Amino acid sequence: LDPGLQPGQFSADEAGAQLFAQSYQSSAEQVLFQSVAASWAHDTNITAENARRQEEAALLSQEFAEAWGQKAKELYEPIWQQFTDPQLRRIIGAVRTLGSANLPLAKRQQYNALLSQMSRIYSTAKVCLPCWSLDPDLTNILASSRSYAMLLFAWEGWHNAAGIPLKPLYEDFTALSNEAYKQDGFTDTGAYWRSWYNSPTFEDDLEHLYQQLEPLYLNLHAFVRRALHRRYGDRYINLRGPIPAHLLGDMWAQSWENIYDMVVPFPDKPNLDVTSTMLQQGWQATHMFRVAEEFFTSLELSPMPPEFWEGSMLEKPADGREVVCHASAWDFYNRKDFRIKQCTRVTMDQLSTVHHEMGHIQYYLQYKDLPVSLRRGANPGFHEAIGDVLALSVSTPEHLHKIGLLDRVTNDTESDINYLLKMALEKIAFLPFGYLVDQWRWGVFSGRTPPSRYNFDWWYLRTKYQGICPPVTRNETHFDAGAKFHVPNVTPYIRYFVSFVLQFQFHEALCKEAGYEGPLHQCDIYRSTKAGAKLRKVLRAGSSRPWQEVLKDMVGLDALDAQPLLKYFQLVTQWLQEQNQQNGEVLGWPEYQWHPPLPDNYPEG
Ligand SMILES: *[C@@H]1O[C@H](CO[C@@H]2O[C@@H](C)[C@@H](O)[C@@H](O)[C@@H]2O)[C@@H](O[C@@H]2O[C@H](CO)[C@@H](O[C@@H]3O[C@H](CO)[C@@H](O)[C@H](O)[C@@H]3O)[C@H](O)[C@H]2NC(C)=O)[C@H](O)[C@H]1NC(C)=O
Ligand SMILES: *[C@@H]1O[C@H](CO[C@@H]2O[C@@H](C)[C@@H](O)[C@@H](O)[C@@H]2O)[C@@H](O[C@@H]2O[C@H](CO)[C@@H](O)[C@H](O)[C@H]2NC(C)=O)[C@H](O)[C@H]1NC(C)=O
Ligand SMILES: C[C@H](N[C@H](C(=O)O)[C@@H]1CCCN1C(=O)[C@@H](N)CC(=O)O)C(=O)N1CCC[C@H]1C(=O)O
Ligand SMILES: *[C@@H]1O[C@H](CO)[C@@H](O[C@@H]2O[C@H](CO)[C@@H](O)[C@H](O)[C@H]2NC(C)=O)[C@H](O)[C@H]1NC(C)=O
Ligand SMILES: [Cl-]
Ligand SMILES: [Mg+2]
Ligand SMILES: [Zn+2]
């Protein structure tokens, strides 16, 4: 480490800790920036040289973190929790957790190389014919093809191409991660991840939430399985068993909005999927990002700065460069550079993804003047919910009419059911997947799931919660959890389950502050400066305040609560129950061993 980046001398009391934090800040911006810039150079141009430069930057960040981290524990470990400044408690508490910087040099190098190699395998994998990339090719197949065998070839090809080679790498990463965080006092890596929510009842609280939500998923599941049976027939759909995992519009069966045209309850009404109108009108990536920006400024939040438009990657590069296409938002920690990297496609669900990533950017813009250690969300679920809240207003048929994407307008019972069913395919279908992914990963980090059971325990949870089955046989040479971005790219997932409940709490509170008095699912907060100011208060706090207190100020309650979500969907919850009873459906999948057969002469066709 450069000496100029090393800590000097400070007293072991609150007065000294304030000076320690100020000196840390003045060097941390330089070290964080160089690491983000090297990650950006790699993710937008994957090459062996850019991976070497990124690993070099990661090693330096670990040297910085060890030096200031060791000094913080030596001076303040027994006293920082009683300091009178709550911002200072948070800064010192973060600095004394060293993470991967606890490892000796050789294991640090091994750790960084695994992260680089795992990212490469996932983002360059391809499916070659008897080659397709995940984005756009395989995504488009899973969303629009209605040929069972074509869908199967894409699903099987992808899970085999990405999952199989990742397994040996993921076993080594898990061991090294645990060794690192044990030295910060955590029993395993999953305990560190859960500690961010600062709640001793976290796991029990989540389970209780899912108990209230499960009847809504079971009824959506049965209704959709019936529609699939009408398309594919008894050979491929078992009305009392799990759904084959490749038929629901998405590589992970994680949201089902892309099969809306196959289940719409009242097909005679206006098409609430505006994708064909976007293409007809000539929308491109730039229009989508400017339309999202103008919603934010209608609320008197900030526009995107010049550095955002000059630096971002909003389309897949056409020079054939290899890139990480998975959509992501980037804070460079210098208060100036903020960017999105997205291989944007012109569709309705991509317009929602644009809003989701721009919600992250807006957070970065609002808290950039805090110390670096507090430039985070109140908890990670807050960060995921911001863009989704705005996107709930944008998708209302009334808002779509205002921005020219839906001409015909009606307010009748059948149109309400269509809209809420489409929104249920996006939000309710996701709940089991958002809940199960880190149940799997927490078991791996704790040792309850060793390598010999990675796939056995993944498919137990997938069938338990989602009611789906793999459409070809799997064994422990397969590593199907590894075929989902967040696993090889080491991003925690329970933030998305928290977000999908929390965003309806935010929507209800902002709709009230805007003076709206109709049904919750027809609220549009567009141009409400009062809602804007309420949201701005949350965003400017960063992680300076306990999240339970920020939530109480915003919505009137200091805990996660499913009731606003239930209220939003109530009309379609009742309708789906009534329909399934009339069709004599079985709720659930009591034939839990069932798998579909292979198509005739497969893969030859
Ligand atoms: C669409 O129509 C609904 C109500 O009409 C219909 O009722 C069903 C039979 C079906 O036909 C549905 O398609 C549809 O819901 C309108 O909702 C009504 O909005 C008004 C004003 O926004 C509400 O009045 C307020 O109610 C609150 C309750 O707390 C009071 O505090 C206020 O003082 C005020 O009285 C009314 O409650 C609400 N009715 C229902 C059943 O929700 C909706 O506005 C309309 N949407 C559009 C875009 O025109
Ligand atoms: C695990 O599965 C792979 C491949 O999947 C198999 O595909 C069919 C045979 C299906 O009916 C299922 O049995 C399996 O899931 C197996 O890889 C095969 O291995 C044998 C011998 O090792 C070889 O002759 C085949 O060519 C292989 N197939 C491929 C596609 O590589 C593997 O044997 C199964 N068992 C283990 C422990 O990995
Ligand atoms: C499309 C979205 N990409 C993530 C996100 O935006 O959350 C990306 C990759 C992982 C983190 N990340 C970031 O951009 C962070 N730098 C933001 C931050 O933490 O500040 C994604 O994965 N989503 C959307 C809902 C369901 C889930 C999914 O698609 O599975
Ligand atoms: C992608 O990254 C590579 C580095 O791996 C860049 O290649 C370098 O480009 C500079 C500028 O022309 C040359 O001076 C170097 O000799 C190149 N190095 C190597 C190893 O080829 C490349 O420019 C990047 N591509 C884009 C589009 O940014
Ligand atoms: Cl999280
Ligand atoms: Mg989709
Ligand atoms: Zn996000």
Tab-separated table of C-alpha atoms and ligand atoms in Angstrom, residues 41 44-51 53 317 319 321, ligand 4:
chain	number	residue	atom	x	y	z
A	41	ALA	CA	-13.683	-1.369	-17.945
A	44	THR	CA	-18.128	-3.317	-20.680
A	45	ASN	CA	-15.189	-5.146	-22.529
A	46	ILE	CA	-14.458	-8.617	-21.188
A	47	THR	CA	-10.805	-9.542	-21.851
A	48	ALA	CA	-8.053	-11.338	-19.965
A	49	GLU	CA	-6.154	-8.047	-19.611
A	50	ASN	CA	-9.127	-6.156	-18.171
A	51	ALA	CA	-9.650	-9.019	-15.703
A	53	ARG	CA	-6.351	-5.004	-14.086
A	317	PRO	CA	-22.307	-2.889	-28.481
A	319	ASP	CA	-18.602	-4.335	-32.569
A	321	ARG	CA	-17.300	-7.007	-27.933
B	4	LIG	C1	-11.065	-3.529	-24.848
B	4	LIG	O1	-10.010	-3.738	-23.944
B	4	LIG	C2	-8.724	-3.908	-24.556
B	4	LIG	C3	-7.760	-4.220	-23.435
B	4	LIG	O2	-7.834	-5.594	-23.087
B	4	LIG	C4	-8.339	-2.663	-25.356
B	4	LIG	O3	-7.155	-2.978	-26.086
B	4	LIG	C5	-6.122	-1.975	-26.019
B	4	LIG	O4	-6.439	-0.809	-26.792
B	4	LIG	C6	-5.432	0.212	-26.753
B	4	LIG	C7	-5.971	1.396	-27.524
B	4	LIG	O5	-6.057	1.118	-28.915
B	4	LIG	C8	-4.129	-0.328	-27.332
B	4	LIG	O6	-3.119	0.670	-27.215
B	4	LIG	C9	-3.702	-1.584	-26.587
B	4	LIG	O7	-2.578	-2.167	-27.238
B	4	LIG	C10	-4.831	-2.610	-26.542
B	4	LIG	N1	-4.441	-3.746	-25.723
B	4	LIG	C11	-4.652	-5.020	-26.074
B	4	LIG	C12	-4.167	-6.053	-25.103
B	4	LIG	O8	-5.217	-5.324	-27.122
B	4	LIG	C13	-9.451	-2.278	-26.327
B	4	LIG	O9	-9.183	-0.992	-26.878
B	4	LIG	C14	-10.817	-2.240	-25.631
B	4	LIG	N2	-11.874	-2.003	-26.599
B	4	LIG	C15	-12.719	-0.972	-26.505
B	4	LIG	C16	-13.754	-0.867	-27.585
B	4	LIG	O10	-12.657	-0.168	-25.584
